[model samples]
Target: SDWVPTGAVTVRAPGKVNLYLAVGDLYHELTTVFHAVSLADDVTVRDADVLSIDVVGQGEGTVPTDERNLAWQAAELFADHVGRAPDVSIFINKDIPVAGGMAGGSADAAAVLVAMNELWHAGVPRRDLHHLAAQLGSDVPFALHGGTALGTGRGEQLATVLARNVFHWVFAFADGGLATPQVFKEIDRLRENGDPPRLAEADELLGALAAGDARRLAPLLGNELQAAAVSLNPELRRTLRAGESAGALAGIVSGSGPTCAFLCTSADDAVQVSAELAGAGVCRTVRVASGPVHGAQVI
Candidate 1:
């Protein structure tokens, strides 16, 4: 029997930045810390005879509205789990940059799952939701939990990390997106030519996060994929440099390529850095946000 949809449900899911990421032979075999920021995407779901998705804001033209979209897939997956028709209309108003190493797509998927579960009253338990989330994407589970988390096992398994204080950040969005697969491929190519230094253990970084000391955490911020990302897009080098010159504590390529994240000492510092970086013209746009915010939720 078709599940009768309730009234419209709206969910907001935050974007994430990997504070510490270490990639091994395969992209999935590594440890990473994911921090959810205030930059978010909102998804609203209502009753419909068939599954349909519409996207606006951010990379609307670039986002697929069909079943190919993560949000649409999420709806289908959830409906299948409940043995019901995937009849819903999903509308996404995006603030997170698409393919900007921010997991905007995963956030949309997480939002849809949260909305649909409630809309259909699927009664799927939280643990089951995590399992379902992992099926969608590695980052989808993190989007569901938000805050600060340690992700492992294809980035799906997550454990909460103690974050005593909020961390301010400035994100420099590049003109275009980078394909994650391409970035990983570049890593392999670079490794074949020469060995890039691997990321050290996260003990110190974890302590800094627990202490809520931005200064201590700043220097520890690292991403193993950064060298590869910069190798692919030389322009990112300039953006990273601009962020540091603008008085950022430190700057690193977010997850993959293009979008660069600059850690700042405080909210005031983040604002100043954002203004300076904007004038630097190293990137297409800039956004200032603070973390670790709550994950996907009804807003």
Candidate 2:
């Protein structure tokens, strides 16, 4: 009989920002450059009679704790894949902003994959984990891989992007969240009447990242859904302008909408930008962060 491992496991998974995202079609074809940031979530899983999720820190009471929660779904999915009872207690210390475009839910889901693979003793290869991750969400794979990667095909197919040095970033968490699907729908609606300007491939962004020059990389950041996000949340415009005015090299919406990412020249500069933007009163809060962090890891 094949032995199966059983124990509690905890894994930390990182959040990300799309340095450049190009939408080829409505929701199918796409290419994005994803960079992992300092903000992350810690997911702890232990055996139990039934699958359960307890989220603290960020979303607290707001985030779903039952079947609707991504972590719970991930645990159920992984349990199904392993041919075992979906019995586990999931505790999440959510540090990443909820629904702020920074792939926080995906990170939790990714952490579940990592944790369950060990807890279940599936011995599922990393490649198989990648496969399982894809089925859960488009960005879940990137959360598992971490660092910088060029993602394609619904943002799951990933290839590592070389980075020469760490990049400084400051994220401004906004008041409300913007659903990713609605943002996509908004983009589709905006295009029917008259196509808004679209971003091209990520050649320039790739080169800038490889060279590790924040200045060169700053202005090159782009996202296809930014227009739709701005259309839904006009208040973000003030945050973006405030970040740049407060000395960020450039500022843009992280992914879907709401949260704003500001690129800075150095760690010191990031702190300065955070303080200035924090005082500007344009955002709910600010975090000084850096990028290219490795993916889910046990601690």
Candidate 3:
């Protein structure tokens, strides 16, 4: 059964970085360490006669507003699931960098699902909501799950990992974003032989998380997609070098490409690294973020 909504519901949805990502094929067999950060997108859902969307902040006017928008797709999905009308006006205040490898768009989709559930008096159960999210995209469920999780199988299968210690990160955003599908295809094209270097088992990295040692974890950060990302966007090489040169304990291409997430030993180190990275001209902008923040929820 569905409940009618009135007034509005605003949800805060956190973004993420793949601490480690292993891509095995184009069919999308992947294993990733999902870290939810404080950089979140804000979305407010209001009752309306017709579905509509307006994006503000971050990329602003650039993100599509129709069926192409992940968040908008989420709304329609929610409507179908609940047998309700997709008659909500959505306003997104995006704090996540668009297409920068951070799950900025996924966060928005997850937030809308939260807003709809919240506005409708939570007619949809939490577990059901997560199940709903998985259908929207691979990353959407994690945006709802939040925190540190181990994701496998196209990144839809998720399980929480042992990570209590706060990990400070400095993220550098490039002037433009990379299209993920093309990036995925590019990787396949680059590694035509099908045997590219891949990260071994994540045992050591998992142990570092359990041990709560940043330095130990720093050297363990790995991303199988990095080679493809760097190949597609050559400038990312400079960004990675600049971040490490500036004192980031380690720097890796976050998710796919364009945005580089630098791991710092401490918050102070993050601030210093971000300040230095901003001036390096390797990237368009910089930001400091920490994880693992809670997932999507209303206010």
Query: How many residue pairs clash in all the candidates, one count each?
Result: 0, 0, 0
Tens digits of per-residue lDDT for model 3, 193-242: 56777897899999999888889999999998888889989999999999
Q: Model 2 scores what on Cα lDDT?
A: 0.89
lDDT of 2 by residue, 1-299 (tens): 11123567888899999999887665558889999998999988888888888888899979999878888778888888889988888888888999999999999999998988887778988998899889889989999999999998889999999878989999999998999999988888888869678886689889999998999999899998888899999999999999998889999898897899999999888988999988998999999888899898765
Give residue 5's lDDT in candidate 1 (0 to 100): 36
For model 1, residues 151-173, the per-residue Cα lDDT tens digits are 98878989899989989999999
Give me the candidate number with maximum lDDT: 1
Score candidate 1 by TM-score against the native: 0.96
TM-score of each model, in listed order: 0.96, 0.96, 0.96
**Cα misplacement distance, residue 34 of candidate 3 (Å):** 0.5
Candidate order, lDDT descending:
1, 3, 2
Worst 10 residues of 1 by lDDT: 1-10
- The regions of model 1 sitting more than 4 angstroms off are 1-6
Candidate 3 TM-score over all chains jointly: 0.96
